[PDB]
Design a binder for this molecule. Structure first.
Ligand SMILES: CC(=O)N1c2ccc(-c3ccc(C(=O)O)cc3)cc2[C@H](Nc2ccc(Cl)cc2)C[C@@H]1C
Length: 119
């Protein structure tokens, strides 16, 4: 019993996740950072909690979260990892920023009170 179905979590899956997934800047974030593929032997030394959209999607779809706040924290971790690891002038930082602005816009219109759904 890791989590529940709530109104806010279904909103995050349908409105937030689907929208970010399809975005033209989403491709670097759809799978975990592969440090071997990218030749970044220090990545896991700097970033201790990797996160990506694929993992968040799996967690949503397998009812992993108990509350929407937990899912929002995973999105935040994905973005913050990017800002912390990469150089300020790297394009990936601008791509993360673009996606995160959309995330915040959609979160501002999330259903206000979280209620467990009968399923
Ligand atoms: C998110 C993040 O912080 N980073 C990240 C993660 C995944 C991939 C990546 C993913 C898939 C492919 C691919 O399928 O070819 C290539 C690169 C790349 C990066 C970033 N590198 C990168 C991004 C865009 C371009 Cl045009 C060139 C290099 C580095 C960073 C660790």
């Amino acid at each position: 019993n890791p989590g529940r179905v709530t109104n806010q979590l279904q909103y995050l899956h349908k409105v937030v996740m689907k929208a970010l997934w399809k975005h033209q800047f989403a491709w670097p974030f759809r799978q975990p950072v592969d440090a071997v593929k990218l030749g970044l032997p220090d990545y896991h030394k700097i970033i201790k909690q990797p996160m990506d959209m694929g993992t968040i999607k799996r967690r949503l779809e397998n009812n992993y979260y108990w509350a929407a706040s937990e899912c929002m924290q995973d999105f935040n971790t994905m973005f913050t990892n990017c800002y912390i690891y990469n150089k300020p002038t790297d394009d990936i930082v601008l791509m993360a920023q673009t996606l995160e602005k959309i995330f915040l816009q959609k979160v501002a219109s999330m259903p206000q009170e979280e209620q467990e759904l009968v399923v």
